[PDB]
Ligand binder design. Structure first.
Ligand SMILES: *[C@@H]1O[C@H](CO)[C@@H](O[C@@H]2O[C@H](CO)[C@@H](O[C@@H]3O[C@H](CO[C@H]4O[C@H](CO[C@H]5O[C@H](CO)[C@@H](O)[C@H](O)[C@@H]5O)[C@@H](O)[C@H](O[C@H]5O[C@H](CO)[C@@H](O)[C@H](O)[C@@H]5O)[C@@H]4O)[C@@H](O)[C@H](O[C@H]4O[C@H](CO)[C@@H](O)[C@H](O)[C@@H]4O)[C@@H]3O)[C@H](O)[C@H]2NC(C)=O)[C@H](O)[C@H]1NC(C)=O
Ligand SMILES: *[C@@H]1O[C@H](CO)[C@@H](O[C@@H]2O[C@H](CO)[C@@H](O[C@@H]3O[C@H](CO[C@H]4O[C@H](CO[C@H]5O[C@H](CO)[C@@H](O)[C@H](O)[C@@H]5O)[C@@H](O)[C@H](O[C@H]5O[C@H](CO)[C@@H](O)[C@H](O)[C@@H]5O)[C@@H]4O)[C@@H](O)[C@H](O[C@H]4O[C@H](CO)[C@@H](O)[C@H](O)[C@@H]4O)[C@@H]3O)[C@H](O)[C@H]2NC(C)=O)[C@H](O)[C@H]1NC(C)=O
Ligand SMILES: *[C@@H]1O[C@H](CO)[C@@H](O[C@@H]2O[C@H](CO)[C@@H](O[C@@H]3O[C@H](CO)[C@@H](O)[C@H](O)[C@@H]3O)[C@H](O)[C@H]2NC(C)=O)[C@H](O)[C@H]1NC(C)=O
Ligand SMILES: *[C@@H]1O[C@H](CO)[C@@H](O[C@@H]2O[C@H](CO)[C@@H](O[C@@H]3O[C@H](CO)[C@@H](O)[C@H](O)[C@@H]3O)[C@H](O)[C@H]2NC(C)=O)[C@H](O)[C@H]1NC(C)=O
Ligand SMILES: *[C@@H]1O[C@H](CO)[C@@H](O[C@@H]2O[C@H](CO)[C@@H](O)[C@H](O)[C@H]2NC(C)=O)[C@H](O)[C@H]1NC(C)=O
Ligand SMILES: *[C@@H]1O[C@H](CO)[C@@H](O[C@@H]2O[C@H](CO)[C@@H](O)[C@H](O)[C@H]2NC(C)=O)[C@H](O)[C@H]1NC(C)=O
Lengths: 426, 426
């Protein structure tokens, strides 16, 4: 944008930091992938490295904190890592790292946050129920205004060893890190006593990097376009792309395929006691498949707490796979096998990833794909497009294909006894 | 509306004519209904009565004209009635009835219209392809600015004896007849040479009777609210409700059930070589069923010319019938059995009705339920609401239930050999 080649459409300044993105996964204890020719760093080790390198600041947006066995009233070896994480966190403030933690208003005092407060970290509880009827569901870390983690892993030891998670760590990308810090600051401001959402956020929260003018970055030595989308709409300044709009733009721009892996997919306002039908994403997928022959693959997690009403809706989508329409939509259920010893571990053994990948773009989110997460509840997503054929997009596609062809993915007609865990959708 | 009880919302003048509505059906030769405790007058006899009583004027909006065996290159007794109809039509102008006939631009000279032109009737061909990319699909009669027929029957002898049709004749309702004449006049104006759709139609085309302020009429001695909706949008003045909006208002207002019988149902722009997904009606039905527990019954016709791609979409809707959601959507295929002697009759033996009925309202249309009919192609619908529990609404519900429970309606898993006719959807 030069004001003479494009007029008032000034393209914002490019970023010259040597950004590098790493996919990070939590693979629960017991899951093996025969082929998986490559593996990604675990969430635990990425988090520990970030904490070890931290020297100035750490901001965490979080849903809940259960990093210790005491938190879950259990006694499991596999909890170590969360505890280790907690330990390292408590070492940040004493050595001079400014720590700020925004957490959804809990239903009672939390041990980890009290210990971190005693260590010198700042903690604020955000009551999103009173503001938007949603919750602070976002999970991300910003380190030294230079690195950040965005993904599905909660501040939960299970998230490291007993729950499958996917996310991304962006290193040496200070521009994007500061951009994410703007969202964090929205949370931080709302975490005070008596604060309300402004009708128009101050300019310090606004951003020039969005769907229309994404940030130009050097990702792994190659040019790429990236931006961060936010939810809910009342928390988005005018320049910040809403999460739903970013997701649907990725869906509508796909010309070859759309692979989606999300723990829950529901074309409804799950909540809102007067229930509401919510076909935004569903209609986007139907549109892609019908109009542009896009092959749609939907990998939905299933465990004992899954909403059974999901099944019908998924079946509805699956019904569009037809010879005459040339529409190609397939649905599979990803189940995490459980042992009798793992069955005592409360609320674990489920695939928690929330991401989508096409032939042109990558979308990594914190939200499940139901209406509330995009209208009332807090969430963030990273969107990256890179003109090459390798890169982070290819890594995401490989992860999805590995999970899709793995024996843990089953069709909707599969028997409930052949999946290795409780599945209300089968 | 009194300007002091409701402000600028002035309710238009009520109609004091003794309006009486009669459901009229074409039941093809060979279809019998064991119970059907009541029967409706045939389309042929209603049309013949209207022609016999006509003394001042007749306006016909039409799609095509094949009223004679010569037109279809056949020799069938069951054609008589169309021919009889044609005969009576030719008697109108010689005895002083002003006849105006608007017809979609045909692909060659039409015999019936040439004969009627020689009889003294005015005929105009409307080229909707050049104006909106659609066709003049509307079928209705206005008689003496007092009566009118609105329904699915074309100016085709088959429509009387070999194709199932549903429609309504409104007698002694001059207010509504003149209102319909306004739509006809839109067609008549566009039927000239070199005319184009005005950006704003002159006031003579506008109407005060619409969804917001329906006409108050005395229907069969009881108060009722009625209005006429029109398609496509470019042909609607500001006061005229578009057909799609009227249909969707009936769908969204239903609290108990929605019964729909339409020859074709497709959530797509069937046409528009770059194909388009079109979920307006589909989403409305999903919304009704999910949010308000409305029981949805979809009776779709199936014959040798049916679009096979319908099946998948219907199955998609049918997939929402689930115990957990409490959603109740059912789909059946209505097939007209054919004989070897009827098989020579070209383009016949199919259910042609286009109507919807709820527990509160009646909708009778000229259009199949696909996108083009509501965006580019000409169509009209009559909407009636009556606070009582009998009336025209109950008659429509009885007709639908008769057709639904009849042996001619089959589920989507039925074998193609058990329906009595070619069915591409089975
Ligand atoms: C953009 O740039 C960034 C930055 O340059 C780049 O990020 C790198 O991405 C690559 C590819 O994904 C990463 O390399 C992979 O790392 C995987 C994880 O390695 C870590 O974890 C290993 C597992 O440790 C646990 O389990 C073992 C079990 O045996 C146990 O002992 C441990 O205690 C622990 O519990 C760990 O072994 C590993 O440490 C070894 O490897 C590192 C290499 O970084 C080395 O420095 C160490 O000294 C040590 O030797 C590390 O801690 C890893 O699994 C994976 O291995 C795959 O390939 C091999 C070879 O074929 C297979 O045999 C194997 O089965 C796996 O399939 C691979 O090495 C790399 O770590 C990232 N770098 C950073 C800083 O994160 C992006 O990829 C770039 N993007 C693009 C598009 O190019
Ligand atoms: C609002 O007001 C309007 C106006 O008042 C009102 O409209 C009336 O609605 C009623 C109910 O729908 C109509 O009455 C029905 O009419 C049916 C059709 O009747 C016509 O067609 C008959 C069939 O003729 C063909 O087939 C026979 C086969 O045997 C053949 O001979 C013929 O040649 C032809 O091919 C025909 O027989 C009939 O003529 C008889 O009946 C009329 C009555 O109008 C009488 O005047 C004649 O002299 C002659 O006797 C007529 O031409 C009819 O099928 C139906 O019958 C049902 O009920 C009987 C009794 O139970 C059953 O035995 C039978 O099997 C059927 O189930 C019934 O009679 C009436 O015609 C409408 N009036 C007008 C002017 O259209 C609305 O209903 C009102 N709305 C509300 C909500 O109240
Ligand atoms: C979970 O809760 C239990 C029970 O409250 C905690 O147990 C505590 O564990 C610590 C060490 O893990 C014990 O402290 C130890 O004291 C000895 C005394 O000499 C000292 O030498 C050691 O170096 C260590 O500091 C502590 O006594 C013990 N408390 C009880 C009541 O048994 C446990 O620490 C909690 N875990 C987490 C992660 O919070
Ligand atoms: C369909 O096409 C055929 C062939 O063109 C038409 O046949 C015509 O039928 C009419 C009567 O139905 C015949 O007219 C008759 O002429 C005698 C002559 O004395 C007269 O006495 C009768 O009263 C009657 O008017 C006409 O000759 C005949 N033409 C041919 C070539 O056989 C038929 O009329 C067409 N049907 C329709 C509905 O248009
Ligand atoms: C991010 O930036 C740091 C600092 O420049 C990089 O750390 C260097 O890494 C190379 C290769 O591993 C070493 O040879 C240098 O000695 C490191 N420098 C310092 C100051 O530590 C780091 O590699 C970059 N990328 C990531 C993913 O951290
Ligand atoms: C519509 O109006 C006409 C004219 O008022 C009605 O015709 C009358 O019908 C009654 C009962 O059938 C007869 O007793 C009268 O002699 C008729 N009058 C005339 C002038 O014909 C007619 O019934 C009304 N309804 C319909 C459906 O036509």
């Amino acid at each position: 944008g030069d004001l003479h080649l494009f007029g008032p459409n000034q393209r914002p300044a490019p970023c010259y930091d040597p950004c590098e993105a790493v996919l990070v996964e939590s693979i629960p204890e017991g899951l093996e992938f025969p082929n998986a020719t490559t593996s990604n760093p675990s969430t635990s080790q990425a988090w520990l490295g970030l904490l070890a390198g931290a020297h100035s600041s750490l901001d965490i947006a979080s849903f809940y904190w259960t990093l210790t066995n005491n938190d879950t009233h259990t006694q499991e070896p596999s909890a170590q890592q969360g505890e280790e994480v907690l330990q390292q966190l408590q070492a940040l403030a004493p050595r001079g790292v400014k720590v700020r933690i925004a957490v959804s208003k809990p239903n009672g005092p939390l041990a980890d946050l009290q210990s971190l407060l005693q260590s010198g970290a700042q903690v604020r509880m955000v009551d999103m129920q009173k503001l938007t009827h949603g919750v602070l569901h976002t999970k991300f870390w910003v380190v030294d205004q230079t690195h950040f983690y965005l993904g599905s892993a909660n501040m939960d030891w299970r998230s490291l060893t007993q729950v499958k998670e996917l996310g991304v760590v962006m290193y040496n990308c200070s521009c994007l890190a500061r951009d994410l810090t703007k969202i964090f600051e929205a949370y931080w401001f709302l975490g005070q006593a008596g604060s309300s959402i402004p009708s128009t956020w101050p300019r310090s929260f606004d951003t020039r990097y969005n769907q229309e003018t994404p940030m130009e970055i050097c990702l792994n030595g190659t040019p790429a376009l990236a931006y961060l989308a936010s939810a809910p709409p009342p928390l988005c300044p005018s320049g910040r792309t809403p999460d739903l709009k970013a997701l649907l733009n990725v869906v509508d721009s796909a010309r070859s395929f759309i692979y989606i892996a999300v723990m829950n997919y529901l074309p409804t306002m799950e909540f809102s006691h007067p229930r509401r039908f919510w076909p935004a994403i569903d209609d986007g997928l139907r549109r892609a498949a019908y109009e542009r022959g896009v092959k749609v693959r939907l990998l939905i997690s299933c465990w004992g707490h899954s909403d059974p009403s999901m099944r019908s809706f998924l079946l509805s989508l699956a019904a569009l796979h037809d010879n005459h329409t040339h529409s190609d939509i397939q649905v599979k259920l990803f189940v995490v096998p459980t042992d009798e010893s793992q069955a005592r571990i409360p609320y674990a053994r489920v695939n928690h990833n929330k991401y989508m990948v096409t032939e042109r773009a990558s979308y990594i989110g914190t939200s499940n794909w139901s209406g509330s997460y995009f209208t009332e509840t807090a969430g963030t997503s990273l969107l990256v497009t890179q003109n090459g054929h390798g890169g982070l997009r290819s890594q995401l596609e490989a992860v999805f294909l590995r999970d899709w062809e793995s024996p843990y993915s089953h069709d909707l007609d599969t028997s409930a006894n052949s999946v290795g865990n409780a599945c209300r959708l089968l």
